[PDB]
Structure 1
Amino acid sequence: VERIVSRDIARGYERIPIPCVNAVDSEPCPSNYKYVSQNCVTSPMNIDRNITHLQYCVCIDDCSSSNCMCGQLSMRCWYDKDGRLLPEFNMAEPPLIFECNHACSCWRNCRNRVVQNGLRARLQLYRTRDMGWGVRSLQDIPPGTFVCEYVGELISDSEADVREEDSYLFDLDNKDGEVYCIDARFYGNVSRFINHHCEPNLVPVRVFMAHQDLRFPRIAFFSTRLIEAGEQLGFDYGERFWDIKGKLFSCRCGSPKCRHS
């Protein structure tokens, strides 16, 4: 017997509502945080917004040709006609995706635009048995489909070293030393409730849209396979997360190939 603890945690900010349900305990809909559907900042981030620094395409079509600068920047356009990733997409070692932007001569409905169109999957925040809150899909999601962005507060590396709660962090590591993270503890979208899984049905991909400042990629989760309606969403948190949390608790992921229990 699952009780509806919220009609939509996003409060209309997403294209579709994201309900919350409980059928495990008496815990109420989470509220010790603020829902934001887009990345925000506290301390000012020097993101390069210079519109003339943007690289862009001058296509006269729907950006399906190999001449599209944006596709070239992404090595090639990885989206098919339905906005899904092509099969020859390296899920184990994702390339950076550069979607068309407002500087491109193309139309707002060209092919190289997917993450920028927001959430299009009916998800649901629900209470699990062991991991607490989790997220699941109320519909079938085909492989290579864009599901959700990992949205939170943009903070510096050092800023990350002075925060008690660090279970809601995503590193945007760069061999440039210039390292940043997205902390969804205080500010975050539905992704902050996604749990870890060793054989994840979601893989994070670095995407670039309105700007192309490589220090600040936005994280878009794509389905690594067919996800069945009712299935819980999951993604690999990575070695740093477990390398520090692996000293506090074991991985309740329950995967036959699990790598952190």
Structure 2
Amino acid sequence: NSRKPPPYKHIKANKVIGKVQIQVADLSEIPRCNCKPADENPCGLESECLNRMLQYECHPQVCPAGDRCQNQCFTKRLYPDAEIIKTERRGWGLRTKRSIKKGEFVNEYVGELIDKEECRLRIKRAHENSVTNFYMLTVTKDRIIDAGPKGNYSRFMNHSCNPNCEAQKWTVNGDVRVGLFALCDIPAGMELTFNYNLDCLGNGRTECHCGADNCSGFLGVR
């Protein structure tokens, strides 16, 4: 009631439950940039990387910079600070230790690969017995990421009409994945939060109880 939530099975990768699986592509359909072996930032963040700009991810077997490039971040998992902490206005929230300049990302959104009909059935069960499951994410047609039973330190996140993160999708090794980022520079020790545009098939539940210029709003107004 006042401490660490009930146990949640931790998973690092994305497992499959339904019928669609991962797409292991060979080293023949992966795009390849045009950077040159150079100073501290090759294929870096302040560079002109044709693969970074278009939201691609380089493979260490094609990128000419070998193992010096910085464009391999989804497969290495050097997540920053701000593990789980407790919030008083909402459930848990998070707070960081070091200030992150604009341009770095936060832990990847992991879960289970349920499908459309399975989401239908699950939300209908949880509705008819009043559980109100709200851990879903549509990434493609008949492909949904579920962070209800499993997940990581990401699924303990909230909404904010004045946010500082963003949910933008990347294509890695011929497969689409979702990752949280940082909008701009922020201080340390505060609660990072992100906006999401809800799409409800029924009724709208509540109003966003954040405090700022325009955070009166609602949950699903725009």
TM-score of the two chains, using structure 2 as the length reference = 0.77
Q: Could you say if the C-alpha distance between residues 123 and 62 of structure 1 is closer, same or farther in structure 2, counting changes exceeding 3 Å?
A: farther
Q: 1:121 aligns with which of 44, 64, 80?
A: 80
Structure 2: tracts of 5 or more residues without a match: 127-131
RMSD of Structure 2 on Structure 1 (CA)? 3.0
Q: Distance in 1 between matches of 2:38 and 2:210?
A: 41
When you count strand as a share of all residues, which structure comes out higher? 1
Match of 1:162, SS state, is helix
Match of 2:29, SS state, is coil
Match of 1:125, SS state, is coil
Is 1:135–1:233's contact at 8 Å kept on the other side of the alignment?
Answer: yes
The one-letter code of the counterpart of 1:99 is E
Q: 1:167 aligns with which of 121, 130, 134?
A: 134
Match of 2:158, SS state, is coil
Aligned structure 1 segments of 4 or more residues deviating by more than 6 angstroms: none
Q: 1:43-58 counterparts in 2 under 5 A?
A: 43-52=18-27, 54-57=29-32
Q: Could you tell me how far 1:52 is from its partner in structure 2? A: 4.7
Percent of aligned positions that are identical: 29
Is 1:54–1:103's contact at 8 Å kept on the other side of the alignment?
Answer: no
Q: Could you say if the C-alpha distance between residues 154 and 79 of structure 1 is closer, same or farther in structure 2, counting changes exceeding 3 Å?
A: farther
Q: Could you tell me how far 1:195 is from its partner in structure 2? A: 0.8
Q: Distance in 2 between matches of 1:52 and 1:247?
A: 47
Corresponding residue for residue 97 of structure 1: 55
Match of 1:131, SS state, is coil
Q: Could you say if the C-alpha distance between residues 126 and 60 of structure 1 is closer, same or farther in structure 2, counting changes exceeding 3 Å?
A: closer
Q: 2:107 aligns with which of 137, 148, 168?
A: 148
Structure 1: tracts of 5 or more residues without a match: 1-25, 65-76, 87-94
Q: Distance in 1 between matches of 2:158 and 2:185?
A: 18
Q: Could you tell me how far 1:116 is from its partner in structure 2? A: 3.2
Corresponding residue for residue 221 of structure 1: 180
Match of 1:117, SS state, is coil
TM-score of the two chains, using structure 1 as the length reference = 0.67
Q: Could you tell me how far 1:232 is from its partner in structure 2? A: 0.6
Q: Could you tell me how far 1:246 is from its partner in structure 2? A: 6.6
Is 2:10–2:150's contact at 8 Å kept on the other side of the alignment?
Answer: yes
Is 2:161–2:208's contact at 8 Å kept on the other side of the alignment?
Answer: no
Residues paired across the two proteins, number: 204
The one-letter code of the counterpart of 1:201 is N
Is 1:99–1:208's contact at 8 Å kept on the other side of the alignment?
Answer: yes
Q: Distance in 2 between matches of 1:112 and 1:155?
A: 29
Corresponding residue for residue 129 of structure 2: none
